[PDB]
Every structure is written in structure tokens, then in C-alpha cells.
Design an enzyme around this catalytic site. Structure first.
Site, PDB file in Angstrom:
ATOM      1  N   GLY A 120       0.820  -1.199   0.000  1.00 31.24           N
ATOM      2  CA  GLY A 120       0.000   0.000   0.000  1.00 31.24           C
ATOM      3  C   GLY A 120       0.847   1.239   0.000  1.00 31.24           C
ATOM      4  O   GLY A 120       1.958   1.250   0.536  1.00 31.24           O
ATOM      5  N   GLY A 140      -0.491   8.674   2.096  1.00 37.02           N
ATOM      6  CA  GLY A 140       0.155   9.932   2.457  1.00 37.02           C
ATOM      7  C   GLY A 140       0.976   9.869   3.727  1.00 37.02           C
ATOM      8  O   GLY A 140       2.015  10.524   3.829  1.00 37.02           O
ATOM      9  N   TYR A 141       0.518   9.085   4.698  1.00 38.60           N
ATOM     10  CA  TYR A 141       1.247   8.928   5.960  1.00 38.60           C
ATOM     11  C   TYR A 141       2.407   7.940   5.868  1.00 38.60           C
ATOM     12  O   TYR A 141       3.220   7.856   6.787  1.00 38.60           O
ATOM     13  CB  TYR A 141       0.302   8.513   7.082  1.00 38.60           C
ATOM     14  CG  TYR A 141      -0.645   9.601   7.486  1.00 38.60           C
ATOM     15  CD1 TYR A 141      -0.206  10.669   8.256  1.00 38.60           C
ATOM     16  CD2 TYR A 141      -1.982   9.566   7.104  1.00 38.60           C
ATOM     17  CE1 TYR A 141      -1.070  11.681   8.633  1.00 38.60           C
ATOM     18  CE2 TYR A 141      -2.862  10.569   7.491  1.00 38.60           C
ATOM     19  CZ  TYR A 141      -2.395  11.625   8.251  1.00 38.60           C
ATOM     20  OH  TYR A 141      -3.256  12.626   8.628  1.00 38.60           O
ATOM     21  N   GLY A 142       2.483   7.197   4.768  1.00 38.42           N
ATOM     22  CA  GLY A 142       3.553   6.231   4.585  1.00 38.42           C
ATOM     23  C   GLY A 142       3.131   5.067   3.721  1.00 38.42           C
ATOM     24  O   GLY A 142       2.229   5.211   2.890  1.00 38.42           O
ATOM     25  N   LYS A 143       3.776   3.917   3.920  1.00 34.37           N
ATOM     26  CA  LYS A 143       3.600   2.762   3.040  1.00 34.37           C
ATOM     27  C   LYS A 143       3.469   1.447   3.812  1.00 34.37           C
ATOM     28  O   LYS A 143       3.752   1.373   5.024  1.00 34.37           O
ATOM     29  CB  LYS A 143       4.765   2.653   2.042  1.00 34.37           C
ATOM     30  CG  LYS A 143       4.929   3.828   1.107  1.00 34.37           C
ATOM     31  CD  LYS A 143       5.935   3.534  -0.010  1.00 34.37           C
ATOM     32  CE  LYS A 143       6.188   4.765  -0.905  1.00 34.37           C
ATOM     33  NZ  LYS A 143       7.178   5.721  -0.329  1.00 34.37           N
ATOM     34  N   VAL A 144       3.044   0.406   3.101  1.00 32.72           N
ATOM     35  CA  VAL A 144       3.135  -0.942   3.637  1.00 32.72           C
ATOM     36  C   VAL A 144       3.870  -1.868   2.663  1.00 32.72           C
ATOM     37  O   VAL A 144       3.597  -1.861   1.453  1.00 32.72           O
ATOM     38  CB  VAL A 144       1.753  -1.524   3.977  1.00 32.72           C
ATOM     39  CG1 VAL A 144       1.893  -2.930   4.582  1.00 32.72           C
ATOM     40  CG2 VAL A 144       1.034  -0.625   4.942  1.00 32.72           C
ATOM     41  N   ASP A 184     -15.095   1.514  11.242  1.00 39.12           N
ATOM     42  CA  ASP A 184     -15.365   1.229   9.847  1.00 39.12           C
ATOM     43  C   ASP A 184     -15.172  -0.226   9.553  1.00 39.12           C
ATOM     44  O   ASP A 184     -14.063  -0.695   9.509  1.00 39.12           O
ATOM     45  CB  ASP A 184     -14.448   2.061   8.952  1.00 39.12           C
ATOM     46  CG  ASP A 184     -15.095   2.427   7.630  1.00 39.12           C
ATOM     47  OD1 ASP A 184     -16.252   2.003   7.380  1.00 39.12           O
ATOM     48  OD2 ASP A 184     -14.445   3.149   6.839  1.00 39.12           O
ATOM     49  N   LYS A 197     -15.928  -1.786   6.689  1.00 32.01           N
ATOM     50  CA  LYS A 197     -15.950  -2.134   5.268  1.00 32.01           C
ATOM     51  C   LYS A 197     -15.216  -3.478   5.120  1.00 32.01           C
ATOM     52  O   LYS A 197     -14.338  -3.799   5.935  1.00 32.01           O
ATOM     53  CB  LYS A 197     -15.264  -1.017   4.468  1.00 32.01           C
ATOM     54  CG  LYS A 197     -13.912  -0.545   5.037  1.00 32.01           C
ATOM     55  CD  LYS A 197     -13.802   0.950   4.957  1.00 32.01           C
ATOM     56  CE  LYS A 197     -12.453   1.439   4.449  1.00 32.01           C
ATOM     57  NZ  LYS A 197     -12.659   2.479   3.363  1.00 32.01           N
ATOM     58  N   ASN A 226     -11.342  -3.607   5.706  1.00 37.75           N
ATOM     59  CA  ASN A 226     -10.750  -3.619   7.049  1.00 37.75           C
ATOM     60  C   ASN A 226     -10.682  -5.020   7.617  1.00 37.75           C
ATOM     61  O   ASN A 226     -10.132  -5.219   8.702  1.00 37.75           O
ATOM     62  CB  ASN A 226     -11.553  -2.758   8.015  1.00 37.75           C
ATOM     63  CG  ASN A 226     -11.488  -1.312   7.680  1.00 37.75           C
ATOM     64  OD1 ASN A 226     -12.461  -0.591   7.856  1.00 37.75           O
ATOM     65  ND2 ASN A 226     -10.344  -0.862   7.177  1.00 37.75           N
TER      66      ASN A 226
END
Ligand SMILES: CCc1cncnc1N1CCN(Cc2nc3cc(C(F)(F)F)ccc3[nH]2)CC1
Ligand SMILES: [Zn+2]
Length: 299
Positions: A15, A18-22, A135, A137, A140
Site C-alpha cells: 500500500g 500519504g502517511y507512509g507505506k506498507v 469502519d 468495510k 478492514n
């Protein structure tokens, strides 16, 4: 410290936000050599400057550690560098529950039931610890190797495009969100039970209960809350959905002081052996300053 970024080979990006990656990663050093983990890496920069983002990040961290459970993702390592935070969580090889519904179209009640049951337990636990998932969805929710459900996401927004500025509540899909959340008019654990309903419906019919022809039209539907049940649903399913999908949060099943128990009791669940289920012994249908951030498991 003994655990450091260089301890994990990077296999691929799961992933980007904006806050970072996985990343999918492999462990190089001896502890669990060659084992696969998922690395969540956050930009200290994006976060320390914002008190909210910062607190949310510390809470995500606390939670993944203070909270051990069979349907809640396990945290294996945490650590930092200069300008980055690292969470090493178990790799969930079974993907999103989303993907399952995608190809299935519709679940058989039995399949639907299994998943909702596990998720129901996970929710009961969090509620017990004053935590609200928010959430539900189908994204998640993820599945391990053995096809069991894991609850995923307690962290920062995963988007690169947000909804407005200010908040990240509505950055992704709103389909499974309770009405009160859309009015910002308060909330509590009852919101999860709504969400479970909205999930169940989607599973059993192949679409969320209030999909509109667009997001705005969708929103209006959720607030109107005029629930249409297809004639093919068993009376139980029909009944359970009628009780979870109530506009009035107070009347929502499970909204009461019985919480998860109220829901788990329902006849929709007569075939669930909860004890076995929690023991995961149940054939699944498929498959500034971040000081004590540093962490290693067991426990
Ligand atoms: C971490 C548990 C997991 C376990 N096993 C396999 N897959 C997993 N995930 C977790 C769910 N995830 C969605 C996602 N979260 C993100 C968070 C960010 C953030 F850095 F926080 F901003 C960026 C992109 C993100 N993409 C990708 C795959
Ligand atoms: Zn966002």
C-alpha cells in the site's frame, strides 16, 4: 537495538498512502528467519507536527500490543529511526474479505454466518476495552492462511486522496457507516453493530444496504434508512438485519448493555459453537517523542 530496518528484506509494496507505506517483507536475521511479515512504515514528519495524528499513532501502537486476540492482527515488532516508524505485523496471506465477496457475488448464509460470528467476537472484545472499531468495510477485514478473520486497521488513513481537510473519517467508502456518524451527532459502540448489519447485508445480497447511484445519493439513503429485505433471506437473517440496521442507535441490537452477547444470542447464530469458534477450531468457508515505541513480541 537488535531490531532494525536492515533486519527485513523488502519484497513488495502492499500500500501507498500519504502517511507512509506498507511492504511485504522477509526477515533476514535469526529470530524468525525467512518468515514473512507486513511492514507498516510511517512518516514521522507528517505525524509529529499534528497532535491528533500523533495521538492516533500512539494509540494504534498501544492497541496492537495491549490487545491480544484470535481475530485481531498480531503485532510482532515496532521500532523507529530518524524520521520513520515501523510496525511489523503478521502477514495475512488470505487477503481482504472484500476479494472473497468480489468473486463470490453472494455468500451462502452459512459462509456469511461464520465470518460475522468471528467479527462479532472481535467487536465484543474491543468494546470491553472501550474501543470502537468504526469502519467495518470488507477491506478492514482480512483472512490469515487458514482462512480465518482478522481485524486490521487502527492506524492512520490509508488514502493518498482524502475527504476534505481536517478529518479522515470519510476518506474511503461510507457504505457501512452508521447514520449518526454521518451527522457527527455523537456516537458509541452501537455504531459497530450497525456496521455489522451493513456488512451482513452486503454479504447476503451482494450489495450494501443503501448504495445510491453516487456518494451523495448514497448518504441520503443511509439517513432515510428505509430498509428493503429481499424475499430470499431466511426469517432469521431478515430479523437480525431488522434489528441491527435501526436508525435509532439506542434500539439497535447490541447497543444495549449486553453488547456483543445480545447479537451473538440471536437465532441467526444457532449453529455457531462459540467456544470452538474462538479457539479457531472451526472449518472456514475458504482457502515526538515515541519514546517506548521500540517493541518485541511475546509479549
Ligand atoms: C497491515 C496488515 C496486513 C497484513 N498482511 C497483509 N496485508 C496487510 N495490509 C493492511 C491493510 N493495508 C491497507 C493500507 N494501509 C495503509 C496504511 C498506510 C499508512 F502508512 F499508514 F499511511 C499506507 C498505505 C496503506 N495501505 C494493506 C495490506
Ligand atoms: Zn484520509
Amino acid at each position: 537495538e537488535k531490531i532494525r530496518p536492515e533486519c527485513f528484506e523488502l519484497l513488495r509494496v502492499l500500500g501507498k498512502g500519504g502517511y507512509g507505506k506498507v511492504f511485504q517483507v522477509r526477515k533476514v536475521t535469526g529470530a524468525n528467519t525467512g518468515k514473512i511479515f507486513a511492514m507498516k512504515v510511517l512518516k514521522k514528519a507528517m505525524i509529529v507536527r499534528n497532535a491528533k495524528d500523533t495521538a492516533h499513532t500512539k494509540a494504534e501502537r498501544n492497541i496492537l500490543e495491549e490487545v491480544k486476540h484470535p481475530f485481531i492482527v498480531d503485532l510482532i515488532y515496532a521500532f523507529q529511526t530518524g524520521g520513520k516508524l515501523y510496525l511489523i505485523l503478521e502477514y495475512l496471506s488470505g487477503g481482504e474479505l472484500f476479494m472473497q465477496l468480489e468473486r463470490e457475488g453472494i455468500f451462502m448464509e452459512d459462509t456469511a454466518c461464520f465470518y460475522l460470528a468471528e467479527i462479532s467476537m472481535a467487536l465484543g472484545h474491543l468494546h470491553q476495552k472501550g474501543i470502537i472499531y468504526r469502519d467495518l468495510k470488507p477491506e478492514n477485514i482480512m483472512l490469515n492462511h487458514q482462512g480465518h478473520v482478522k481485524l486490521t486497521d487502527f492506524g492512520l488513513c490509508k488514502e493518498s486522496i482524502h475527504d476534505g481537510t481536517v478529518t479522515h473519517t470519510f476518506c474511503g467508502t461510507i457504505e457501512y457507516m452508521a447514520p449518526e456518524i454521518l451527522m457527527r451527532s455523537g456516537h458509541n459502540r452501537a455504531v459497530d453493530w450497525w456496521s455489522l448489519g451493513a456488512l451482513m447485508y452486503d454479504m447476503l445480497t451482494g450489495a450494501p444496504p443503501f448504495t445510491g447511484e453516487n456518494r451523495k445519493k448514497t448518504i441520503d439513503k443511509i439517513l432515510k434508512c428505509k430498509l428493503n429485505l429481499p424475499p430470499y433471506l431466511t426469517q432469521e437473517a431478515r430479523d437480525l438485519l431488522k434489528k441491527l440496521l435501526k436508525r435509532n442507535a439506542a434500539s439497535r441490537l447490541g447497543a444495549g448493555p449486553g453488547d456483543a452477547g445480545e447479537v451473538q444470542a440471536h437465532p441467526f447464530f444457532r449453529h455457531i459453537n462459540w467456544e470452538e469458534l474462538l479457539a479457531r477450531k472451526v472449518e472456514p468457508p475458504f482457502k515526538e517523542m515515541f519514546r517506548d515505541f521500540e517493541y518485541i513480541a511475546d509479549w
